[PDB]
Every structure is written in structure tokens, then in C-alpha cells.
Amino acid sequence: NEVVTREYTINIHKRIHGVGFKKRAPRALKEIRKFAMKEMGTPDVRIDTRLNKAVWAKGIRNVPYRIRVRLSRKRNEDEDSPNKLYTLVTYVPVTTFKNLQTVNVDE
Amino acid sequence: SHRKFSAPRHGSLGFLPRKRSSRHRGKVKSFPKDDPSKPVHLTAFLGYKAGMTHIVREVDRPGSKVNKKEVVEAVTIVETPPMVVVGIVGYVETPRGLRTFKTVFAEHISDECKRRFYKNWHKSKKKAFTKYCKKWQDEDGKKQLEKDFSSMKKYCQVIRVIAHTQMRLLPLRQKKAHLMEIQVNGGTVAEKLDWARERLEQQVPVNQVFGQDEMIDVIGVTKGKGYKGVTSRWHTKKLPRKTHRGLRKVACIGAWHPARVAFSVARAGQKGYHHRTEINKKIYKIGQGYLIKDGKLIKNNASTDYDLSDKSINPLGGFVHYGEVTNDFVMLKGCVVGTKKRVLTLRKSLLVQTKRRALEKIDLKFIDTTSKFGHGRFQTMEEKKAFMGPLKKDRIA
Amino acid sequence: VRYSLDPENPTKSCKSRGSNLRVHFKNTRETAQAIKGMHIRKATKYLKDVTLQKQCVPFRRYNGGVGRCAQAKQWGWTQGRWPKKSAEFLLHMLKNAESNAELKGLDVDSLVIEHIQVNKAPKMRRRTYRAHGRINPYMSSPCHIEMILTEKE
Amino acid sequence: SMLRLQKRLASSVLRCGKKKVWLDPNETNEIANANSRQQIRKLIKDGLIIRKPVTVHSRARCR
RNA sequence: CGCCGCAGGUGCAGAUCUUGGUGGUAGUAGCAAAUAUUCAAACGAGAACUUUGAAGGCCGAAGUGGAGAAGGGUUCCAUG
RNA sequence: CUCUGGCAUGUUGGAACAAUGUAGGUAAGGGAAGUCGGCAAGCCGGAUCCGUAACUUCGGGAUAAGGAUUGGCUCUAAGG
Numbered sequence: 037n038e039v040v041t042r043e044y045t046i047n048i049h050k051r052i053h054g055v056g057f058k059k060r061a062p063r064a065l066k067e068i069r070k071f072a073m074k075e076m077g078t079p080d081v082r083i084d085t086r087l088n089k090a091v092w093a094k095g096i097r098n099v100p101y102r103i104r105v106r107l108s109r110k111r112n113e114d115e116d117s118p119n120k121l122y123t124l125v126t127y128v129p130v131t132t133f134k135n136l137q138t139v140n141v142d143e
Numbered sequence: 144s145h146r147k148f149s150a151p152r153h154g155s156l157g158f159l160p161r162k163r164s165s166r167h168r169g170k171v172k173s174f175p176k177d178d179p180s181k182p183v184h185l186t187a188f189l190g191y192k193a194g195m196t197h198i199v200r201e202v203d204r205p206g207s208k209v210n211k212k213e214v215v216e217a218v219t220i221v222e223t224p225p226m227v228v229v230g231i232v233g234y235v236e237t238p239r240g241l242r243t244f245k246t247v248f249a250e251h252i253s254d255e256c257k258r259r260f261y262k263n264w265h266k267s268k269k270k271a272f273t274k275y276c277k278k279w280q281d282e283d284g285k286k287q288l289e290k291d292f293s294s295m296k297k298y299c300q301v302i303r304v305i306a307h308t309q310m311r312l313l314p315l316r317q318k319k320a321h322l323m324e325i326q327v328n329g330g331t332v333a334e335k336l337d338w339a340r341e342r343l344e345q346q347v348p349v350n351q352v353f354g355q356d357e358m359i360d361v362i363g364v365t366k367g368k369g370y371k372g373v374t375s376r377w378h379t380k381k382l383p384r385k386t387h388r389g390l391r392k393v394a395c396i397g398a399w400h401p402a403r404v405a406f407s408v409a410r411a412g413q414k415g416y417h418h419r420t421e422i423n424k425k426i427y428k429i430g431q432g433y434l435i436k437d438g439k440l441i442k443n444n445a446s447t448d449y450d451l452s453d454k455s456i457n458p459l460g461g462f463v464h465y466g467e468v469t470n471d472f473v474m475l476k477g478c479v480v481g482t483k484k485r486v487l488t489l490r491k492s493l494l495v496q497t498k499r500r501a502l503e504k505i506d507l508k509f510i511d512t513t514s515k516f517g518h519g520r521f522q523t524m525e526e527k528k529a530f531m532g533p534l535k536k537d538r539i540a
Numbered sequence: 541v542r543y544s545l546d547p548e549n550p551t552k553s554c555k556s557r558g559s560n561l562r563v564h565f566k567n568t569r570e571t572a573q574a575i576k577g578m579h580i581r582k583a584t585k586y587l588k589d590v591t592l593q594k595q596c597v598p599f600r601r602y603n604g605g606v607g608r609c610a611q612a613k614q615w616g617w618t619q620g621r622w623p624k625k626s627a628e629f630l631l632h633m634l635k636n637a638e639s640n641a642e643l644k645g646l647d648v649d650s651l652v653i654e655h656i657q658v659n660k661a662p663k664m665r666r667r668t669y670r671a672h673g674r675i676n677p678y679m680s681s682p683c684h685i686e687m688i689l690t691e692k693e
Numbered sequence: 694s695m696l697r698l699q700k701r702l703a704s705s706v707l708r709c710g711k712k713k714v715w716l717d718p719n720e721t722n723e724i725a726n727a728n729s730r731q732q733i734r735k736l737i738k739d740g741l742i743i744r745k746p747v748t749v750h751s752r753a754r755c756r
Numbered sequence: 757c758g759c760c761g762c763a764g765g766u767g768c769a770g771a772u773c774u775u776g777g778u779g780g781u782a783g784u785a786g787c788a789a790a791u792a793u794u795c796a797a798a799c800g801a802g803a804a805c806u807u808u809g810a811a812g813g814c815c816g817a818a819g820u821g822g823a824g825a826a827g828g829g830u831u832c833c834a835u836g
Numbered sequence: 837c838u839c840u841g842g843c844a845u846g847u848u849g850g851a852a853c854a855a856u857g858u859a860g861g862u863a864a865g866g867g868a869a870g871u872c873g874g875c876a877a878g879c880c881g882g883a884u885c886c887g888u889a890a891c892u893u894c895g896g897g898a899u900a901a902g903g904a905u906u907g908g909c910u911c912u913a914a915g916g
């Protein structure tokens with residue numbers, strides 16, 4: 037429906053390839069923001085502070101290669117904002133990234 | 144006064160407006176001269192640059208130092224699936240040049256050809272040539288069409304065949320086909336016209352257009368470099384280290400008194416993406432593609448009668464930035480303009496090859512299929528895994 | 541007060557002006573020339589497209605040094621930009637105009653910009669500091685804007 | 694709202710730096726209506742303003 | 757203001773004239789010395805820049821720290 | 837490089853990564869052929885153990901020149 041939640045992994049390495057040292061973690065964050073927008077369709081994505089910490093975990097220029105996030109399109113009926121659907125992006129800690137599919141998670 | 148030390152001209156003035164090419168394909172601009180004594184044939188073809196590798200052959204050059212010894216030569220691989228003739232244009236020569244008299248297209252033109260006719264195939268209704276194939280299937284339109292054929296026979300002097308490449312057989316992202324006019328040579332106009340309308344709606348292979356170990360010409364668009372300065376663009380001498388407003392310049396552009404910068408001094412601008420026509424490119428081998436008789440077979444590619452292995456022309460990990468060759472290919476000697484995936488016009492020579500450097504039958508001993516994605520050291524996967532034995536993933540498998 | 545080009549019918553027209561507005565006169569004049577003649581809904585959607593950089597303002601007269609844009613081929617030309625401040629000032633004036641139209645009781649869904657002009661305002665003076673103890677002017681170029689919309693469908 | 698005065702005044706009554714003063718991000722209104730010492734002191738006693746511990750500079754490596 | 761007389765600090769295109777105003781240049785040059793920001797929330801009509809929290813960083817005690825003398829004179833502090 | 841303390845990158849941001857620049861690197865084989873001129877860059881560099889020429893105002897020259905060693909870990913002696 038529209039209260040949906042999935043789990044993705046993002047290849048920050050190929051989304052970050054080539055950018056300057058003092059720009060890699062901010063570039064990674066707006067790459068995540070664009071990825072979340074395009075996987076959903078909603079503007080107003082909100083990046084969780086733990087996800088911000090995970091992106092910035094090794095400083096500004098050694099960003100992790102793959103990140104495991106949970107996207108969740110949720111209702112916005114708490115502010116009278118022009119769009120009724122926002123997307124919260126949270127951070128999923130994992131050990132390995134092998135054989136990890138995109139998975140719909142339950143309520 | 145008197146530049147005090149002779150140095151030749153930097154760069155060539157026979158090659159300039161040194162601007163971006165207005166086309167991506169590569170126009171022929173000169174076909175071979177027609178003599179009706181020859182059989183009817185085509186004179187050009189359209190391939191795609193896959194990549195480079197190198198070969199080993201034994202040279203038969205009497206008097207040369209490498210006579211009856213083995214050399215290594217770089218080659219370029221051009222994938223050439225057969226071209227579909229779908230149209231035919233005729234030309235009449237006038238005192239103003241040579242103008243197109245009449246084109247005739249065929250019924251049932253393919254969707255990649257119509258993709259060439261459209262600039263946005265996604266939003267289109269794909270309506271091209273529908274009213275035309277209507278007049279092909281009609282009977283009033285049919286007598287009109289043969290009347291056009293008969294008028295072309297009695298008036299035209301130069302006929303050409305409109306053929307497109309079929310991009311569904313290529314590993315490329317592009318689905319839009321490439322069309323081309325290929326001159327038909329060797330006969331009377333009636334003879335070549337019935338020959339071409341026999342070949343209408345049909346496939347023509349590079350085996351039928353070209354042959355083994357002949358020298359052809361390659362026409363294409365030089366690899367693109369962008370806006371460059373005079374040191375990269377014209378190879379002028381760099382100025383000394385203590386030069387105030389820049390080193391990579393030309394220090395003087397003309398004298399005082401022609402009072403203008405001439406067209407012949409070196410300036411910064413576009414380098415590359417240039418239309419070039421290189422000649423005397425020797426064909427080393429014409430491939431055969433991936434045929435299926437049974438459990439299929441790819442040795443008809445680089446099996447060279449002195450190795451007898453079962454390897455294709457493709458290296459390990461495929462051709463870098465191209466894909467893999469599953470169609471008929473052409474192996475040329477040496478380097479060839481353009482990027483990988485760049486479309487190359489290939490045409491017959493318009494000189495006569497009487498040279499012992501030319502008219503030479505070659506015979507390959509070895510074709511290198513190591514990986515070009517690094518310093519690859521194995522020819523085939525079987526050779527690699529037989530040299531290394533079982534691995535950890537193989538063992539757990 | 542005293543508009544240039546009084547309308548044909550001052551019962552089916554509505555007008556709006558604004559003076560001493562701190563937007564660039566040249567950018568706003570190009571935006572005004574792009575907006576002239578449009579319907580009011582099309583003009584609002586276009587100016588919001590400008591502020592989101594989906595449609596450009598073609599720079600035709602005050603075009604020296606202005607870069608080239610693929611969106612000028614609609615208004616077939618080569619130079620275009622996206623004046624944000626000009627777009628928002630014109631949107632404020634357009635909504636004031638539709639407010640005047642609904643106040644005097646006209647069909648707001650059938651108004652067309654019949655007249656729009658941009659005049660220069662008096663300049664406001666600031667300073668800049670230069671190399672050998674010099675001080676140069678740092679003036680602003682504000683503008684008066686006026687527009688007259690007209691009921692016609 | 695704006696807690697610059699409260700940050701400065703808390704650093705004063707806690708005898709530390711403004712880098713060490715922690716203001717509760719949820720009780721922003723109750724902090725914001727505190728224009729005095731003894732109001733800052735009340736907030737410290739009820740735990741809405743906290744002095745933060747020093748970031749550790751260990752000597753285990755050099756030992 | 758016209759006519760008869762009378763009297764001039766009495767006629768401008770210039771003087772690198774003087775004072776004032778305005779152009780083209782031109783929406784141009786430019787807003788590039790000292791490593792760096794990011795996420796969320798709040799207030800608010802309005803947030804890249806305010807405040808709060810979290811993170812990542814810098815000055816690194818011959819400091820971008822804490823106090824003074826000259827000098828400044830209210831710049832200090834709250835509120836709007 | 838870090839702690840206490842302080843800050844928000846030095847009067848703006850975003851997107852790209854052409855030429856020419858400015859600042860910083862690297863470079864096969866040669867090794868000053870470059871240039872007015874080795875300009876600029878590079879080489880050398882700390883410490884320990886050896887070993888140090890002409891000349892001299894006998895003080896110096898002198899770190900002359902030249903050579904070797906240098907990490908980690910486990911011990912053994914000697915020095916209150």
C-alpha cells in the first residue's frame with residue numbers, strides 16, 4: 037500500500053567514486069537521499085541520526101562501501117504539509133553483505 | 144626578420160577546421176571507380192570496434208630480416224553482423240554534380256530501422272512507412288513502383304543500396320540502427336538494379352562483401368578529447384619554467400604587419416571527435432560467429448590450425464568496455480580510430496594493390512585471448528583452472 | 541496612482557504595481573517579457589517552473605556573458621537563466637493582482653496579462669574597497685513594476 | 694528558541710566550558726524560561742542541565 | 757511682454773574646463789590565503805547560514821585558550 | 837597527534853571536473869645537452885661507531901672528505 041517498509045543495500049562505493057576527500061561523506065548522504073527518493077517516489081526523506089553516524093563512522097573520506105538501510109514510506113497526517121507521504125531512512129547493522137537481497141519487511 | 148633556425152610546420156593544414164565532426168558514423172566521401180566488366184558487388188560495410196589484441200604469424204618476405212620467422216602484431220577486432228538491405232537509391236550525374244533521382248524502399252522495414260527514423264521512439268506512434276508499405280501491397284501502387292524501377296533503369300548512372308545494421312545482435316545499449324548508402328559496382332545499371340532488388344529486404348554478410356587478406360580503408364570518428372590547449376592540440380614546444388603568464392602557449396602568433404592572426408598559427412580548441420579516413424588496413428581474418436549445429440561450437444573463431452583449442456575471439460572477462468562478439472568479425476592489422484563501441488565504415492580500397500607488402504597471403508599461428516582487464520596470464524578458463532587446481536569456493540561447492 | 545497604458549475597460553481589468561523593489565532590474569525585465577501575454581494560471585505555473593529550474597527565462601537584451609541552456613529552445617534562443625528573486629517578486633505581484641480582481645468581482649480563471657513593464661528605481665548606494673586605497677560604488681538596481689490583467693476568454 | 698544566555702550562565706554556575714554544558718533538547722521551553730542563576734541551579738538539581746564528562750585521554754598506551 | 761532711450765557679471769561644443777547627473781562596459785570582472793562539514797528537532801510567514809542535540813573535524817598550552825597595558829568610548833548586559 | 841578551553845574554515849552557496857593558470861606530486865632511458873648563469877627542483881640530513889687532507893694567525897679548517905649501523909621481540913651484564 038503506502039505504509040510500506042523494505043530493506044535495501046546501497047553501494048556507496050560506486051555512488052561515491054571519484055569525488056574529493058573533503059566531500060565524500062556529504063556526497064554519500066545526498067546519494068542516499070537520491071536513492072531513497074527514487075526507490076520510493078516521495079520527497080521529504082528523513083535520514084536517521086544513527087544512519088548519519090554510520091555514514092560518518094570513519095570520518096569524511098573513508099565512507100563504507102555498502103550500507104544496509106531500511107526504507108519506510110509512512111503517513112504524514114501529523115503536519116499539514118503538501119505531500120501526504122514521507123520516507124524515513126534508518127540504518128541496519130549487519131555482518132556480511134553476501135547474498136543479501138532487497139526484502140519487504142512486515143508491520 | 145628571419146626565424147634564424149629552420150623548423151618544419153607543427154601539424155597539418157590539410158586537416159583543419161579542427162572542429163567536432165558533424166556526423167557520428169563516418170561518410171565514405173569517395174567510393175571505388177566503376178567498371179562494368181566486373182561482377183556486381185558492394186563496396187563498403189559497417190562494423191563496430193570491439194577491442195584490440197595481438198597475434199603471432201610467420202612472415203614470408205624475401206630479402207627481409209623477418210623472413211620465415213614469427214612476429215607479433217597488434218590487431219583490431221571489428222564486429223560485423225550482416226547488414227539488411229532495405230532500400231535502394233539512384234543518382235544521375237548533372238553539370239552541377241550528382242543528384243539523387245529516386246529512392247525505393249521495401250515492404251516490412253524493421254523496428255530498429257524505424258528507430259533510426261525517429262528521434263524519440265518512446266513517445267512516437269511508430270507510423271513511419273505505413274502508407275508506403277500500403278502501396279507496396281496494393282496493385283495500383285505496385286505498377287507505380289515498377290514504373291519507378293524502369294525509369295531508374297533508363298535514366299540513372301549510379302545506384303546505391305540503403306542497408307542498416309541489426310543492433311539486436313550486438314552487446315550494446317543502442318537499439319537504434321545505423322543506415323548507410325553503399326555503392327553498387329560492376330555492371331550495367333539494369334544488371335545492378337535487378338541484382339539489388341533481388342537482394343532487397345535481405346541480409347548481406349561481410350563474407351560476401353570483403354575477403355581474406357585484402358587491404359581496405361577504415362573511415363570513422365577519432366576518439367574525443369574535448370577543449371585542449373596548443374601543446375596537446377598542435378604539439379608545439381613548451382615554454383621554459385620561468386614564464387610569467389603560462390607555459391603551455393604559443394609565444395608569438397604572427398608578425399605585426401599582416402595585422403591579423405593568421406589561420407595557420409596554433410590555437411586552443413577542440414581536439415578529437417574528428418572525421419578521419421585511414422587507408423591500407425590489412426584484413427587478417429574474417430570470423431564466423433556462434434553457430435548452433437548441436438551442442439554448439441565456437442572454435443570457428445580463434446582456432447588457428449596450430450593450436451586446435453576451443454576458444455573464441457573473446458578474451459577472459461570479455462572485451463573491456465564493449466561486451467562479447469557473437470557475430471561475424473573482421474580482424475584488421477593495426478590500430479583504428481574511435482572508442483570502443485564506435486561504428487566504423489569499412490570500404491574497399493580505391494587504389495590498386497600491386498605491392499609485395501600488399502598482395503600477401505597471411506597465415507596465423509596464434510591469437511592472444513588473455514584478459515585485457517589487467518595483466519591477464521591465461522588464455523582459457525580450462526587452462527587457468529587446470530594450472531591452479533581446485534579453489535576454496537570450488538571445494539565448498 | 542498613474543499607470544502607463546490605461547486599459548480599454550476599467551471594469552474588466554485589474555491592475556497592480558510595486559515600487560523600490562530590491563530585485564535586479566535586468567533579470568526582472570527579462571522575466572516580465574517572458575511573462576507578458578500569458579494566462580494567469582499558465583503564468584503562475586511557469587514562474588514556479590522557473591523557481592524550480594524546469595523552465596528558463598530567455599535573456600534577449602541584457603544577455604552579455606549569460607550562459608547557454610537547453611530550455612531556451614522553447615523560447616527559441618540560446619541564452620537563458622532562472623531568476624529566482626524576479627520570479628518570486630512577480631508571483632507576489634500576480635497574486636496581488638488576482639486579489640484585486642476577486643475584490644472587484646471578476647472571473648479570476650480567465651485573466652490575461654495585457655500589460656507589464658519594469659522601470660528603474662532610484663539607486664541605493666554602498667561601497668567596495670579597492671587596491672590602492674580606493675573606494676568604488678556598489679550600487680543596487682531596484683525597479684518599479686506595474687502590470688494590468690484583463691478578463692478575456 | 695535561543696539558549697545562548699542559558700548556555701553561558703550554566704557554564705558559569707557549573708565551572709566548566711560551554712562545550713561541556715548539556716541542555717536538554719526535549720525540555721527546551723523549561724530551559725528557555727530560565728533567565729537567572731538559581732533558575733539554572735534549580736535546573737541542574739532536577740537534572741535538565743547536565744555537566745558532561747571529560748572525553749578520555751588515556752595513558753594506557755604510554756604506560 | 758511690445759516700442760523709444762539707458763546699463764551690463766549679456767549668447768558655448770571644446771579649455772586632460774568646473775559642479776551635478778547618467779550611460780556603454782555589464783548582469784561582466786569578481787564574492788578562490790590559513791584542511792570541513794553532516795543529520796534531526798525547535799522557534800518562526802520564511803532556515804545552507806539562528807538555537808538545541810548527535811556525529812565528524814580544527815586551534816593543539818611560542819593556542820583560534822584565560823587575563824591585562826596603550827588605544828577605543830558604551831562597543832558591555834537583557835528585551836524587542 | 838591528543839586533553840582543558842575555544843571554534844565553524846575566515847565577507848556566500850550548489851553543480852560539474854575543459855583549456856590556461858596558482859600551489860603540490862610523480863616520471864622509462866639519459867643526466868645540465870637547458871639557460872646569461874644548475875634559476876628552480878632534486879640530492880644530503882638525526883644519532884652511534886670509525887676515519888678525516890691541503891692550508892693556517894696553530895685557535896681552526898671540521899659535521900672537512902669518506903664508510904658502517906639503526907626495526908620488533910626475548911634476555912645477560914654493569915652503573916645506587
Ligand SMILES: [Mg+2]
Nearest residue numbers: 145146147149
Ligand atoms: Mg631561413
Ligand SMILES: [Mg+2]
Nearest residue numbers: 385386387388
Ligand atoms: Mg619572472
Ligand SMILES: [Mg+2]
Nearest residue numbers: 514515516517
Ligand atoms: Mg588492459
Ligand SMILES: [Mg+2]
Nearest residue numbers: 604605606784
Ligand atoms: Mg565577452
Ligand SMILES: [Mg+2]
Nearest residue numbers: 668669670671
Ligand atoms: Mg577589495
Ligand SMILES: [Mg+2]
Nearest residue numbers: 671672673674
Ligand atoms: Mg588602505
Ligand SMILES: [Mg+2]
Nearest residue numbers: 764765766767
Ligand atoms: Mg561672463
Ligand SMILES: [Mg+2]
Nearest residue numbers: 768769770773
Ligand atoms: Mg557645454
Ligand SMILES: [Mg+2]
Nearest residue numbers: 768769770771
Ligand atoms: Mg569653440
Ligand SMILES: [Mg+2]
Nearest residue numbers: 605784785786
Ligand atoms: Mg560571473
Ligand SMILES: [Mg+2]
Nearest residue numbers: 785786787788
Ligand atoms: Mg569567483
Ligand SMILES: [Mg+2]
Nearest residue numbers: 814815816837
Ligand atoms: Mg590537531
Ligand SMILES: [Mg+2]
Nearest residue numbers: 821822823824
Ligand atoms: Mg585573550
Ligand SMILES: [Mg+2]
Nearest residue numbers: 058791792845
Ligand atoms: Mg576551504
Ligand SMILES: [Mg+2]
Nearest residue numbers: 805844845848
Ligand atoms: Mg561557511
Ligand SMILES: [Mg+2]
Nearest residue numbers: 844845846847
Ligand atoms: Mg572575518
